[PDB]
Design a protein around this ligand. Sequence first.
Ligand SMILES: O[C@@H]1[C@@H](O)[C@H](S[C@@H]2CO[C@@H](S[C@@H]3CO[C@@H](S[C@@H]4CO[C@@H](O)[C@H](O)[C@H]4O)[C@H](O)[C@H]3O)[C@H](O)[C@H]2O)OC[C@H]1O
Length: 314
Amino acid sequence: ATTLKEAADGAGRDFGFALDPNRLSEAQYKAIADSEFNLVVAENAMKWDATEPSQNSFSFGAGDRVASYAADTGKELYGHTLVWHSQLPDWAKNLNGSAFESAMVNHVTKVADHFEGKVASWDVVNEAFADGGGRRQDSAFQQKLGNGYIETAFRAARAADPTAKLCINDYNVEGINAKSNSLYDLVKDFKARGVPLDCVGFQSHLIVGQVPGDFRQNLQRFADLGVDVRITELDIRMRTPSDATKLATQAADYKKVVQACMQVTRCQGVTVWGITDKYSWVPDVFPGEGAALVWDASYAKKPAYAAVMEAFGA
Ligand SMILES: O[C@@H]1[C@@H](O)[C@H](S[C@@H]2CO[C@@H](S[C@@H]3CO[C@@H](S[C@@H]4CO[C@@H](O)[C@H](O)[C@H]4O)[C@H](O)[C@H]3O)[C@H](O)[C@H]2O)OC[C@H]1O
């Protein structure tokens, strides 16, 4: 292999990136997108704010651009995300009771129908759980609809799209902890009762030098419930600026994550949350942190690149 795409292809797994379709007009960004990944997810273009800016009025141009990119380059398309407490328009927050439930159901139905046969897998529900266990405490869905909204969303997604893989996705669930235990309980319950659910996403927004040692064990216990697993939003952030020590640790960390996936037969692959440090979401949220991705801000491969290639078995 001479590319990460070749390494993942050869391993029989997915290696994906989060796309901003506006950056396709930057040729260096597009060149790396085209050659280094076999899967694409929309970083933002398929979220609720980007797709349904007023009630039952849809704006699919940006999401269509991502889908067309996937089809034109022969990449798998991953859908992110139907139901999420963040990036939720005010019009939806202003609804309550059955009117809010109906807005959720309609959003799920219209977006899944629109992309049916193009999107292969959906994050149907994103970030439902709380650090420390139990349900998220600042969610319009949890607050307005209670526990049952997750099952409602999954059943509605399956009613719209009979074949797509339907995933639940979360962060800080890479290790075995109260949060991943709550997620595990739900997955086991859904499978037991025949609620549509095919996959679990592990965002893997990690900090340099802090990869959970029980990541593989955790992925495996989920796979053993009868679902696929995936690393969905990988990045590994450090204090900026980078130096040799930090870049070496980061490379080792990327290798640990990709190896954990390789070691679980039903781990579909790894998606990184962007291409270049130039555009990473990290510095805006975490002051003085960054350099989290595989390419630096001038599109040079970082040591993480060779580590990913090695971990895929190339
Ligand atoms: O105006 C919008 C603008 O809001 C967005 S900016 C957008 C935000 O979403 C990020 S993806 C990011 C990834 O991490 C997860 S989990 C996160 C991990 O660290 C924890 O301690 C944090 O508290 C958690 O939130 C986040 O939930 C998720 O938001 C995108 O990459 C950014 O682009 O852009 C579009 C504009 O129209």
